[PDB]
Amino acid sequence: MNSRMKIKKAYEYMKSFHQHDTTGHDIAHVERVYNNACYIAKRENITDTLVIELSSLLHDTVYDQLKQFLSTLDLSSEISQQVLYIIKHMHVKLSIDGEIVRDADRLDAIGAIGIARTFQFSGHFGEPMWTETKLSNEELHTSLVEELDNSAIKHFYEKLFKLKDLMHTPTAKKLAEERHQFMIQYLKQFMSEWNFNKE
Amino acid sequence: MNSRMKIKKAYEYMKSFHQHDTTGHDIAHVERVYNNACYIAKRENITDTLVIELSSLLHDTVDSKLTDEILAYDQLKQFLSTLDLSSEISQQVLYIIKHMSHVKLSIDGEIVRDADRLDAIGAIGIARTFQFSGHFGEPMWTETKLSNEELHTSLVEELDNSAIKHFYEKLFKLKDLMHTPTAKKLAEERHQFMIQYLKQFMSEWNFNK
Ligand SMILES: [Zn+2]
Ligand SMILES: [Zn+2]
């Protein structure tokens, strides 16, 4: 079988693994990471993208069962072990293939989607959208943010705003800047409403 | 005590009413409705804002999640009796509260209703919508072929529950329901913000699709 058929099989395996997810969230997430990774790969001029595509599609299915499935794709040990290593370490440095899967995954954590995911989690945990703090806005970008009670907005300062600068590839950095800029815009709009006519 | 002192006590009563809210949303929500209502009232040139201020602060005090409407009203009426309000004022406030928990209201009631509605849209509406979906365990969006225009129809009721679905089924219809010019202006900006958020959201959702 060729690479195309193998990727197709990995795609099928992934959907089957998450078939019992009555939200489709898991599958959608994997698909976005996969599509982001493919966009980055081409942009970074990567000839063979088998490792990247397999890693992206299967990174969330975890290794006995994974090794079993991979054992049916007729892959060499070098490639097989390559994918497993990436999935396992997806802190150590990785090959460009691994750093691209990382970038694709990181990108899904920011932007309109990252914001949406963040608020969903807060709602799931019954956390507030935001809380009043005595810390200055500037201090929120430092470790002092850990002193805040959990809130969706806290997560913007503690994690989301730091992801763009962590992108590895130039293409991922570019995509990240757009989504980063958007999150700032959302925050400013959020605060304008939160403090509307408040004084 | 004077008018703003009675308002202060209504504010204190509201914070006590929602004291058990562990999410902190309830109190913050009322403060924003109050602040929006005061903004609209000044811009609409409402002279006496007593009814608007008291009503906005107490607009949801007859909906106790822990108890019931019977005990809630009893407490509310008891609290209002301590403010030494005139018959008309008291009646006006209670009337707004009742129709706050399709009938037309006075300008004062419409302003409170406008302020309340505003808090359902914009960045805040986006946030609460996603939080609710998280609480209900629903996805942020579902796979569908229906176009934007189509989703703005009663056909949206065919999609499975999701956060984005709530944008078309409710959020996007609120701006047109604003009564006062000032609230219509504020809504236009919050409404356009939601449109832009949806566009960005979909651009990421279908990225390199
Ligand atoms: Zn992932
Ligand atoms: Zn309300």
Side-chain angles (χ1 to χ4, degrees), chain B residues 152-174:
Chain B
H152 282 293
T153 319
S154 65
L155 301 187
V156 64
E157 305 168 63
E158 310 187 321
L159 296 173
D160 286 345
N161 295 310
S162 79
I164 295 297
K165 179 188 182 187
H166 193 71
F167 285 33
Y168 292 94
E169 185 170 59
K170 181 190 178 185
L171 305 201
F172 281 141
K173 303 171 185 179
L174 305 188

Side-chain angles (χ1 to χ4, degrees), chain A residues 73-171:
Chain A
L73 299 182
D74 188 48
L75 304 170
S76 64
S77 57
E78 201 165 3
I79 289 170
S80 186
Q81 298 316 81
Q82 234 288 204
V83 172
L84 291 167
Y85 188 80
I86 291 179
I87 292 178
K88 177 180 177 175
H89 298 280
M90 204 295 273
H91 186 57
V92 302
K93 302 185 69 287
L94 293 181
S95 60
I96 185 176
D97 308 58
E99 301 294 6
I100 289 179
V101 177
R102 279 190 171 159
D103 283 352
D105 178 60
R106 201 182 295 101
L107 287 169
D108 206 55
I110 57 172
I113 292 178
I115 285 174
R117 174 173 305 155
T118 296
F119 279 113
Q120 283 204 306
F121 261 107
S122 63
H124 176 253
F125 289 127
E127 308 173 0
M129 291 176 262
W130 178 221
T131 62
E132 302 302 7
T133 175
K134 55 85 174 187
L135 297 177
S136 67
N137 298 314
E138 284 68 34
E139 289 181 298
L140 259 41
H141 285 103
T142 73
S143 60
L144 296 177
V145 71
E146 306 179 327
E147 296 178 1
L148 278 164
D149 292 353
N150 292 346
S151 67
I153 295 301
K154 170 180 176 184
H155 197 63
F156 279 53
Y157 296 94
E158 188 181 21
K159 214 271 189 299
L160 310 189
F161 287 145
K162 302 183 182 304
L163 297 182
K164 182 264 291 179
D165 287 337
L166 295 186
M167 298 294 172
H168 185 78
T169 65
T171 306

Side-chain angles (χ1 to χ4, degrees), chain A residues 35 112 120 122 127 186 193 197, chain B residues 123 131 133 140 197 204 208:
Chain A
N35 295 326
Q120 283 204 306
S122 63
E127 308 173 0
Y186 176 92
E193 296 176 23
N197 196 52
Chain B
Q131 285 197 306
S133 61
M140 29 190 104
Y197 177 93
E204 295 172 32
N208 195 52

Side-chain angles (χ1 to χ4, degrees), chain B residues 36-52:
Chain B
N36 307 326
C38 288
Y39 182 84
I40 296 166
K42 180 53 218 171
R43 295 305 181 300
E44 290 304 316
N45 291 302
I46 303 301
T47 315
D48 195 312
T49 58
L50 182 55
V51 177
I52 291 170

Side-chain angles (χ1 to χ4, degrees), chain A residues 174-189:
Chain A
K174 231 87 71 183
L175 298 172
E177 293 179 306
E178 187 203 74
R179 299 178 180 180
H180 180 77
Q181 162 183 291
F182 185 90
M183 300 195 288
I184 300 302
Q185 286 157 283
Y186 176 92
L187 210 213
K188 206 173 190 185
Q189 175 79 201

Side-chain angles (χ1 to χ4, degrees), chain B residues 29 33 59-60 116:
Chain B
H29 161 73
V33 170
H59 81 276
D60 67 9
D116 188 56

